[PDB]
Amino acid sequence: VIKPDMKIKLRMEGAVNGHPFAIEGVGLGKPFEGKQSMDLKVKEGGPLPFAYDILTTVFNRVFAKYPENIVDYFKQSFPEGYSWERSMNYEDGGICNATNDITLDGDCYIYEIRFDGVNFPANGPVMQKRTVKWEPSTEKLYVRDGVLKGDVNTALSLEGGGHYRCDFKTTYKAKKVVQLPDYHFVDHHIEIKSHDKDYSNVNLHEHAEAHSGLPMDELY
Protein backbone atom coordinates (compact mmCIF):
# COMPACT_ATOMS: atom_id res chain seq x y z
CA VAL A 1 0.00 0.00 0.00
CA ILE A 2 2.66 2.68 0.69
CA LYS A 3 5.67 2.68 -1.58
CA PRO A 4 9.12 4.05 -0.64
CA ASP A 5 8.56 6.86 -3.18
CA MET A 6 5.16 8.55 -3.28
CA LYS A 7 3.78 11.53 -5.16
CA ILE A 8 1.68 14.45 -3.95
CA LYS A 9 -0.96 16.53 -5.69
CA LEU A 10 -3.13 19.08 -3.91
CA ARG A 11 -5.46 22.03 -4.28
CA MET A 12 -6.10 24.57 -1.53
CA GLU A 13 -9.00 27.00 -1.61
CA GLY A 14 -9.33 29.58 1.11
CA ALA A 15 -9.44 33.15 2.35
CA VAL A 16 -7.60 35.41 4.80
CA ASN A 17 -9.40 38.38 6.39
CA GLY A 18 -12.15 37.82 3.82
CA HIS A 19 -9.99 37.80 0.70
CA PRO A 20 -10.13 34.56 -1.32
CA PHE A 21 -7.27 32.71 -2.99
CA ALA A 22 -6.36 29.31 -4.38
CA ILE A 23 -3.09 27.37 -4.64
CA GLU A 24 -2.19 24.09 -6.31
CA GLY A 25 0.84 21.95 -5.67
CA VAL A 26 2.61 18.83 -6.87
CA GLY A 27 5.29 17.07 -4.94
CA LEU A 28 7.08 13.93 -3.87
CA GLY A 29 8.26 12.29 -0.69
CA LYS A 30 9.45 9.19 1.10
CA PRO A 31 6.96 8.30 3.86
CA PHE A 32 9.30 5.90 5.70
CA GLU A 33 12.13 8.45 5.87
CA GLY A 34 9.69 11.19 6.93
CA LYS A 35 10.70 13.58 4.14
CA GLN A 36 8.76 15.32 1.39
CA SER A 37 9.05 18.22 -1.03
CA MET A 38 6.59 20.07 -3.25
CA ASP A 39 6.24 22.96 -5.68
CA LEU A 40 3.31 25.28 -5.06
CA LYS A 41 1.76 27.82 -7.42
CA VAL A 42 -0.83 30.46 -6.65
CA LYS A 43 -3.72 30.18 -9.10
CA GLU A 44 -6.15 32.80 -7.72
CA GLY A 45 -5.99 35.83 -5.44
CA GLY A 46 -2.33 36.62 -6.12
CA PRO A 47 -0.23 38.41 -5.17
CA LEU A 48 -1.04 37.10 -1.69
CA PRO A 49 -1.24 40.04 0.78
CA PHE A 50 -0.33 37.89 3.82
CA ALA A 51 2.67 35.94 5.10
CA TYR A 52 2.96 32.73 3.09
CA ASP A 53 4.21 30.94 6.22
CA ILE A 54 0.70 30.67 7.68
CA LEU A 55 -0.16 28.20 4.90
CA THR A 56 2.82 25.86 4.87
CA THR A 57 1.94 23.41 7.65
CA VAL A 58 -1.41 22.97 5.92
CA PHE A 59 0.43 21.87 2.74
CA ASN A 60 0.26 14.81 5.75
CA ARG A 61 1.53 12.90 8.78
CA VAL A 62 2.16 9.81 6.63
CA PHE A 63 5.35 11.76 5.83
CA ALA A 64 6.81 11.07 9.26
CA LYS A 65 9.40 8.45 10.19
CA TYR A 66 7.60 6.15 12.62
CA PRO A 67 9.63 3.68 14.70
CA GLU A 68 8.45 0.10 15.10
CA ASN A 69 7.59 0.55 18.79
CA ILE A 70 4.98 3.26 17.97
CA VAL A 71 1.75 2.44 16.13
CA ASP A 72 1.44 4.32 12.82
CA TYR A 73 -2.09 5.74 12.73
CA PHE A 74 -1.50 7.32 9.31
CA LYS A 75 0.20 4.58 7.31
CA GLN A 76 -2.52 2.21 8.55
CA SER A 77 -5.31 4.37 7.12
CA PHE A 78 -4.49 3.80 3.47
CA PRO A 79 -5.50 3.05 0.74
CA GLU A 80 -8.78 4.56 2.00
CA GLY A 81 -6.94 7.55 3.49
CA TYR A 82 -7.82 9.94 6.28
CA SER A 83 -8.83 13.54 6.91
CA TRP A 84 -7.75 16.20 9.37
CA GLU A 85 -9.05 19.47 10.80
CA ARG A 86 -6.97 22.13 12.52
CA SER A 87 -7.18 25.46 14.29
CA MET A 88 -4.03 27.59 14.39
CA ASN A 89 -4.41 30.20 17.14
CA TYR A 90 -1.80 32.95 16.93
CA GLU A 91 -0.91 34.98 20.00
CA ASP A 92 -2.31 38.26 18.60
CA GLY A 93 -5.72 36.71 17.92
CA GLY A 94 -5.31 35.82 14.26
CA ILE A 95 -6.80 32.35 13.87
CA CYS A 96 -6.72 29.95 10.91
CA ASN A 97 -9.04 26.98 10.45
CA ALA A 98 -7.97 24.33 7.96
CA THR A 99 -9.13 20.96 6.67
CA ASN A 100 -7.50 18.35 4.44
CA ASP A 101 -9.18 15.34 2.85
CA ILE A 102 -6.40 12.95 1.81
CA THR A 103 -7.14 10.18 -0.68
CA LEU A 104 -4.85 7.81 -2.56
CA ASP A 105 -4.73 7.40 -6.35
CA GLY A 106 -2.11 4.81 -7.28
CA ASP A 107 1.18 6.15 -5.92
CA CYS A 108 -0.07 9.75 -5.54
CA TYR A 109 -1.65 11.30 -2.47
CA ILE A 110 -4.41 13.77 -3.36
CA TYR A 111 -5.26 16.60 -0.96
CA GLU A 112 -8.47 18.63 -0.95
CA ILE A 113 -7.64 21.55 1.35
CA ARG A 114 -9.68 24.43 2.78
CA PHE A 115 -8.05 27.32 4.67
CA ASP A 116 -9.74 30.21 6.49
CA GLY A 117 -7.95 32.80 8.63
CA VAL A 118 -9.61 35.76 10.33
CA ASN A 119 -8.78 38.66 12.66
CA PHE A 120 -5.18 39.19 11.57
CA PRO A 121 -4.51 42.84 12.52
CA ALA A 122 -3.37 45.17 9.75
CA ASN A 123 -0.14 46.02 11.60
CA GLY A 124 0.72 42.45 12.59
CA PRO A 125 3.54 40.29 11.24
CA VAL A 126 1.18 38.22 9.07
CA MET A 127 -0.53 41.02 7.13
CA GLN A 128 2.83 42.88 6.88
CA LYS A 129 4.84 39.75 5.92
CA ARG A 130 7.42 39.96 8.71
CA THR A 131 7.81 36.21 9.27
CA VAL A 132 11.04 34.39 8.43
CA LYS A 133 10.26 30.71 9.03
CA TRP A 134 8.61 28.22 11.33
CA GLU A 135 10.93 26.94 14.00
CA PRO A 136 11.36 23.18 14.33
CA SER A 137 8.59 21.75 16.47
CA THR A 138 7.60 18.78 18.61
CA GLU A 139 3.94 17.86 18.23
CA LYS A 140 2.19 15.78 20.88
CA LEU A 141 -0.32 13.19 19.72
CA TYR A 142 -2.93 11.34 21.77
CA VAL A 143 -6.23 9.52 21.32
CA ARG A 144 -9.58 11.06 22.20
CA ASP A 145 -12.95 9.48 21.34
CA GLY A 146 -11.50 6.88 18.97
CA VAL A 147 -9.54 9.38 16.85
CA LEU A 148 -6.07 10.91 17.09
CA LYS A 149 -5.42 14.49 18.21
CA GLY A 150 -2.33 16.62 17.73
CA ASP A 151 -1.40 19.58 19.95
CA VAL A 152 1.72 21.72 19.66
CA ASN A 153 2.69 25.22 20.76
CA THR A 154 5.21 26.47 18.18
CA ALA A 155 6.40 29.80 16.80
CA LEU A 156 7.43 31.75 13.71
CA SER A 157 10.72 33.64 13.74
CA LEU A 158 10.33 37.33 12.85
CA GLU A 159 12.23 39.75 10.63
CA GLY A 160 13.60 42.07 13.30
CA GLY A 161 14.46 39.39 15.81
CA GLY A 162 11.88 37.63 17.94
CA HIS A 163 9.17 35.03 17.75
CA TYR A 164 5.48 35.09 16.88
CA ARG A 165 3.61 32.38 18.74
CA CYS A 166 0.89 29.98 17.53
CA ASP A 167 -1.13 27.19 19.16
CA PHE A 168 -2.00 24.18 16.98
CA LYS A 169 -4.94 21.85 17.65
CA THR A 170 -5.39 19.09 15.05
CA THR A 171 -7.91 16.25 14.80
CA TYR A 172 -6.90 13.27 12.63
CA LYS A 173 -9.71 11.01 11.39
CA ALA A 174 -9.01 7.68 9.73
CA LYS A 175 -11.70 6.61 7.27
CA LYS A 176 -11.08 2.96 8.20
CA VAL A 177 -10.85 1.17 11.54
CA VAL A 178 -7.17 1.18 12.49
CA GLN A 179 -5.17 0.51 15.62
CA LEU A 180 -4.74 3.49 17.92
CA PRO A 181 -1.32 4.67 19.12
CA ASP A 182 -0.25 5.53 22.62
CA TYR A 183 0.78 9.04 23.64
CA HIS A 184 3.77 9.99 21.50
CA PHE A 185 5.49 12.84 19.69
CA VAL A 186 6.38 13.94 16.18
CA ASP A 187 9.29 16.32 15.65
CA HIS A 188 8.88 18.55 12.61
CA HIS A 189 11.03 20.90 10.60
CA ILE A 190 9.33 22.62 7.66
CA GLU A 191 11.25 24.95 5.37
CA ILE A 192 10.64 27.12 2.34
CA LYS A 193 13.74 26.43 0.26
CA SER A 194 12.99 28.75 -2.66
CA HIS A 195 10.36 31.25 -3.76
CA ASP A 196 9.87 34.13 -6.14
CA LYS A 197 9.34 37.74 -5.14
CA ASP A 198 5.59 37.59 -4.43
CA TYR A 199 5.50 33.87 -3.48
CA SER A 200 3.47 32.79 -6.51
CA ASN A 201 6.00 29.93 -6.76
CA VAL A 202 7.22 28.17 -3.60
CA ASN A 203 9.41 25.10 -3.07
CA LEU A 204 8.48 23.60 0.30
CA HIS A 205 10.25 20.88 2.29
CA GLU A 206 9.40 19.01 5.48
CA HIS A 207 11.20 16.47 7.66
CA ALA A 208 9.30 14.71 10.46
CA GLU A 209 10.09 11.87 12.86
CA ALA A 210 7.97 10.21 15.54
CA HIS A 211 9.37 9.32 18.97
CA SER A 212 8.30 8.66 22.57
CA GLY A 213 10.23 11.36 24.44
CA LEU A 214 13.21 11.20 26.76
CA PRO A 215 14.52 7.57 26.64
CA MET A 216 19.10 3.86 22.73
CA ASP A 217 22.34 5.54 21.57
CA GLU A 218 24.28 3.39 24.06
CA LEU A 219 27.34 3.27 21.76
CA TYR A 220 26.32 -0.16 20.42
Q: Which residues are annotated as a binding site for Cu(2+)?
A: 195, 205, 207
Q: What distance lies between CA 25 and its chain's CA centroid?
A: 14
114 binds a second copy (CB under 8 A): yes
CA–CA dist 89, 95 (Å, integer):
5
Query: Is 24 in contact with 111 (CB distance < 8 Å)?
Result: no
Instruction: Please select the residue that binds a second copy; options are 105, 135, 196, 198, rule is CB under 8 A.
Output: 135
165 binds a second copy (CB under 8 A): yes
The β-bridge partners of 174 are 82
Q: Minimum CB separation from a second copy for residue 205, in Å?
A: 9
Instruction: Please select the residue that binds a second copy; options are 136, 159, 194, 196, rule is CB under 8 A.
Output: 136
Cis peptide, bond prior to residue 20, ω within 30 of zero: no
194 binds a second copy (CB under 8 A): no
The binding site for a second copy (CB under 8 A) comprises: 15, 17-18, 83, 85-87, 89, 93, 95-99, 101, 114, 116-119, 121-123, 135-138, 140, 142-147, 151-155, 157, 162-163, 165, 167, 169, 171, 183, 185, 187-189, 191, 207-209, 212-215
